[PDB]
Amino acid sequence: SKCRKAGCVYFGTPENKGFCTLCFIEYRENK
C-alpha cells in the first residue's frame, strides 16, 4: 500500500486517495 507518488517511500491510505498523509496535503493544496 505504498503512497501513489513516484519517489515516495511512505505508505498511503484509501481515505487519502492513495497518498501518504503529506502528499495528500500537497495534493489538496495544489488541488
Binding site: 500500500s1 505504498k2 517511500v9 505508505f11
Partner: protein, 147 residues
C-alpha cells in the same frame, strides 16, 4: 523461493525484535531493506544510532546479503563507502544465518574491532597503538554523525 525466505525472516523480527536492531523493507519492495543498529553500551559508539542498507541477492539465502552503512563511523573495519569487512558476509556465510544474526555480529564488531583485517589501516593503527585516542575519536564521530 527467496521471497518466501525474506518474508519468514521479516515475520520473526516482528515476533522477537533484537532489542537494538531493526530491519524492514524500503517501500513495498521486499528485496531491498533498511536497518538500524543502536550504539552498544560501554562502547565508544554508545547512544548513537546507525543506519544501514541491505540488498538480498535473488539466490538468497544461498548467497549472503549485501550490507552497507549509510551513517558515518570511525571504525577500522568500516570504510568511507560504508563497506563492512566481515567474514560472515563473504566466505563464512551460511544460509542458516539470518539478517537478525548478522546485524548482531556487526554490532559485536563495533564492540570488538578486527585490528588485523583493516579496511582503513590508519584507524586500525590507532586501535593498537593508542587505544584511548581511538575511543576519543570514535565518540566525536558518534556525536556528530549518529546523534
Amino acid at each position: 523461493m527467496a521471497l518466501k525466505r525474506i518474508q519468514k525472516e521479516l515475520s520473526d523480527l516482528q515476533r522477537d525484535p533484537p532489542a537494538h536492531c531493526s530491519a524492514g523493507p524500503v517501500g513495498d519492495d521486499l528485496f531491498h531493506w533498511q536497518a538500524t543498529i543502536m550504539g552498544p553500551p560501554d562502547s565508544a559508539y554508545q547512544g548513537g544510532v546507525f543506519f544501514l542498507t541491505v540488498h538480498f541477492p535473488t539466490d538468497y539465502p544461498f548467497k549472503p546479503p549485501k550490507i552497507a552503512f549509510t551513517t558515518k563511523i570511525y571504525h577500522p573495519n568500516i570504510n568511507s563507502n560504508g563497506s563492512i569487512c566481515l567474514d560472515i558476509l563473504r566466505s563464512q556465510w551460511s544460509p542458516a544465518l539470518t539478517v537478525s544474526k548478522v546485524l548482531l555480529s556487526i554490532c559485536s564488531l563495533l564492540c570488538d574491532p578486527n585490528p588485523d583485517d583493516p579496511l582503513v589501516p590508519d584507524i586500525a593503527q590507532i586501535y593498537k597503538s593508542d587505544k584511548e585516542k581511538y575511543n576519543r575519536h570514535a565518540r566525536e564521530w558518534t556525536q556528530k554523525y549518529a546523534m
